Design an enzyme around this catalytic site. Structure first.
Site, PDB file in Angstrom:
ATOM      1  N   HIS B  56       0.799  -1.128   0.132  1.00  0.00           N
ATOM      2  CA  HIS B  56      -0.015   0.052   0.004  1.00  0.00           C
ATOM      3  C   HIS B  56       0.954   1.307   0.079  1.00  0.00           C
ATOM      4  O   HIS B  56       0.394   2.255  -0.171  1.00  0.00           O
ATOM      5  CB  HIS B  56      -0.957  -0.092   1.261  1.00  0.00           C
ATOM      6  N   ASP B  80      -0.596  -7.630   1.595  1.00  0.00           N
ATOM      7  CA  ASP B  80       0.006  -6.213   1.854  1.00  0.00           C
ATOM      8  C   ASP B  80       1.611  -6.219   1.948  1.00  0.00           C
ATOM      9  O   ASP B  80       2.163  -5.662   2.813  1.00  0.00           O
ATOM     10  CB  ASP B  80      -0.529  -5.327   2.808  1.00  0.00           C
ATOM     11  N   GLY B 136       3.448   6.528   8.489  1.00  0.00           N
ATOM     12  CA  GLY B 136       4.731   6.365   7.889  1.00  0.00           C
ATOM     13  C   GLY B 136       5.964   5.414   8.363  1.00  0.00           C
ATOM     14  O   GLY B 136       7.076   5.443   7.828  1.00  0.00           O
ATOM     15  N   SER B 138       4.957   2.259   8.340  1.00  0.00           N
ATOM     16  CA  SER B 138       4.440   0.946   7.545  1.00  0.00           C
ATOM     17  C   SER B 138       5.801   0.090   7.312  1.00  0.00           C
ATOM     18  O   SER B 138       6.616   0.772   6.983  1.00  0.00           O
ATOM     19  CB  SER B 138       3.743   1.226   6.518  1.00  0.00           C
TER      20      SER B 138
END
Ligand SMILES: [Zn+2]
Lengths: 12, 174
Positions: B56, B80, B136, B138
């Site tokens: 993502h 993901d 941010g 991730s």
């Protein structure tokens, strides 16, 4: 469009 | 017992240039890489010679490397997760092998925050955090007490801008 390394995080 | 600092390597101009030229000739180092695109920025975690991050943020893009752009060796939209062969210099971490529920989430800002393992892909924060503190981060790693990779940070569960638990991609998949 390439993803870029803009910094790193160093662990210990 | 686990601590981290950050080191910046580029600004906007270099970042935009590097995206078009697909060629990052800077030195690589560290366990976690701070990645960026045009729109957004996030983290990658190196485990067993592979930079892992979230789809993502990374999408299906290449990673700008020394020899040129690096194709994703792994790409799963549902879970993901994406992986690139790590460029030379990256310090590859290792999976957990111990089953501890006492986890540590390393953030974009080189902050290490306590996390309780609760499910196969879930953990609760011991101190609720603003959602902006987590945004941010991730692709950032969740560590076991001895600093091995339990998983990779994917999503957070919120209520009115404050996050009380985290969802992560478990390391087994990788
Ligand atoms: Zn462990």
């Amino acid at each position: 469009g390439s993803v870029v390394i803009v910094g790193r995080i160093i662990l210990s | 017992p686990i601590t981290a600092y950050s080191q910046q390597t580029r600004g906007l101009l270099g970042c935009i240039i590097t995206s078009l030229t697909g060629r990052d000739k800077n030195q690589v180092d560290g366990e976690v890489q701070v990645l960026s695109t045009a729109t957004q920025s996030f983290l990658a975690t190196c485990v067993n010679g592979v930079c892992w991050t979230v789809y993502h943020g990374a999408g299906s893009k290449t990673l700008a490397g020394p020899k040129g752009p690096i194709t994703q060796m792994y790409t799963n939209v549902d879970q993901d997760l994406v992986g690139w062969p790590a460029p030379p210099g990256a310090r590859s971490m290792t999976p957990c092998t111990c089953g501890s529920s006492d986890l540590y989430l390393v953030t974009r800002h080189a902050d290490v925050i306590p996390v309780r393992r609760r499910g196969d892909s879930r953990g609760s924060l011991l101190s609720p955090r603003p959602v902006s503190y987590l945004k941010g981060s991730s692709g950032g790693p969740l560590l076991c007490p001895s600093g091995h990779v339990v998983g990779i940070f994917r999503a957070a569960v919120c209520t009115r801008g404050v996050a009380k638990a985290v969802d992560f991609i478990p390391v087994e998949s990788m």
